Amino acid sequence: MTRLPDIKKEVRFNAPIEKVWEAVSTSEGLAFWFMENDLKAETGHHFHLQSPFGPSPCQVTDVERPIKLSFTWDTDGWSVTFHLKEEENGTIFTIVHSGWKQGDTKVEKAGAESAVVHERMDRGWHDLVNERLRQIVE
Numbered sequence: 001m002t003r004l005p006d007i008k009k010e011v012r013f014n015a016p017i018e019k020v021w022e023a024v025s026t027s028e029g030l031a032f033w034f035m036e037n038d039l040k041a042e043t044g045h046h047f048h049l050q051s052p053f054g055p056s057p058c059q060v061t062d063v064e065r066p067i068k069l070s071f072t073w074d075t076d077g078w079s080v081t082f083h084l085k086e087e088e089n090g091t092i093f094t095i096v097h098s099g100w101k102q103g104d105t106k107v108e109k110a111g112a113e114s115a116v117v118h119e120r121m122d123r124g125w126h127d128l129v130n131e132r133l134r135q136i137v138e
Contacts (some may be wrong), residue, residue: 004114007097007122011129015137017086020093021066023136024082033133039071049073066091076109091137095129097121 013020023029025041036050037058045060062070066084073080076099083094100114110117 002102004100004103004118006100007118007125008095009122009126009129010092010094011133012087012089012092013134013137014090017066017084017091019137020091021084023133024066024069024084024093025063029136032136033128041069074109076107093129093133095125097125 023032025039027037027039027047030039031037038047039045039058039060040047041060041063043060043063045063047058047060049056049058056074057072059072060070061072061079062068062081066086069082069084071080072078078097078099080098081096083092083096085092085094100118103115106113107117112120
């Protein structure tokens with residue numbers, strides 16, 4: 001249309017949303033799959049991220065029970081939102097990573113094109129919230 005597509009994925013794991021939540025509410029639980037951090041599932045909080053690419057600040061925007069969760073990462077403009085919801089089969093986890101520009105503008109931060117990175121990131125993003133996370137509950 002007039003922009004790049006967002007990176008929204010969804011997965012289903014067998015476990016109590018409580019565990020998953022706690023796994024996506026704490027830092028250790030997060031870093032367990034995501035990355036090292038000092039998150040405490042608290043809105044208006046201030047926590048940094050110890051990534052390999054380099055240290056970057058992070059700040060929670062929304063966090064209340066296993067229903068809505070969001071946190072900022074980097075300065076460029078990369079934000080991801082999490083959505084949890086307990087179901088019959090088990091727990092439902094939906095990820096949403098947005099923060100791209102028109103399909104042409106190259107990323108000065110990362111390096112490779114936005115689309116390229118999008119696919120790359122998405123890939124790992126999915127794989128991340130595919131098994132890497134499931135293992136946190138499995």
